[PDB]
Every structure is written in structure tokens, then in C-alpha cells.
Structure 1
Amino acid sequence: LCGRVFKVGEPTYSCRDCAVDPTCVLCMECFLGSIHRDHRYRMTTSGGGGFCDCGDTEAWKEGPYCQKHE
């Protein structure tokens, strides 16, 4: 229920422990309210476009939702 579309220069966060593949990402809001802030995460700046995968159970091996969207 996030669905945020990233803007130019916006940080995106993946979790190296939980992402199903390297394109699985969270926006800043969802990352900071998720279990993955305590994991090995990777921040990549968006060039614009793409979207947050919070809530997609097929994107995450654990912790698919943040506290705001669960």
C-alpha cells in the first residue's frame, strides 16, 4: 500500500539479507520502519522511476511490510 514512485536523486534501500533479488527496494519511510534497518542494507540513489516494494511478499524473504503499512 506504499507504492511510492522514486524521484530523481532519491535514496532507495535494499536488504542484502532479505531481498529476493537486487531490484527489490524500500523507500526511506518504509526502510526506517522495517526490520531491515538492523540488517546488511544497500542504499542506491534513484535516477528517477522505479517504486517501493513494501508489502510485496514475493520481494522479501522476511519482513515484507514496514510498521506503517502492515
Structure 2
Amino acid sequence: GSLCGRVFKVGEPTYSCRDCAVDPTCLLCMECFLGSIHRDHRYRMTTSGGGGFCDCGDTEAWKEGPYCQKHE
């Protein structure tokens, strides 16, 4: 697998899976979120303040489903 690493732009949607995130900072970009198991989980979309990055592909950021279809 690979890391997404997408750097969030100010104002861009970010996705936190409440069921799977290890800590509050664990986030997915829209593309990864919708290609992941988390699309059907309890989640929160928050608009980014800019900076940070998508954590898709980080096995320590997710209790389940660390990769999406693109990055696995």
C-alpha cells in the first residue's frame, strides 16, 4: 500500500471516522473517505483550516480499514 499524503487546503472537506479514528487528528480526504469502509461508518466532515494531511494508508491512524481502494 501507499500513503495518500494529500495536503488539505483552507476550506477543504476533511473526514473523521468516529468509529475508527485513533485520535482527533486522524483525517481522510474526500476521495479516500468515499473509497474506504468509513463511507458507511459514523463520521464527521469538518472544513479544514488549511494544512495537515490525509492519513489514508497510515495503519496507526485507523483501528480498521487504514487504506482506501486507491491506496491499498
| TM-score, length-scaled by structure 2 | 0.95
SS in 2 for 1:14: strand
Structure 1 runs of 4+ aligned residues shifted over 4 Å read none
Aligned to 1:37: 39
CA RMSD of aligned residues (A): 0.5
Aligned residues with identical type, % of pairs:
99
C-alpha distance after superposition, 1:27-66 (max 9, x if no partner): 0000010000000001110011010000000000000000
Deviation at 1:23, TM superposition (A): 0.6
TM-score normalised to structure 1 length: 0.97
Q: Which runs of 5+ in 2 are unaligned?
A: none
Q: How many residues are treated as equivalent by the alignment? A: 70
Show structure 1 runs of 5+ residues with no match.
none
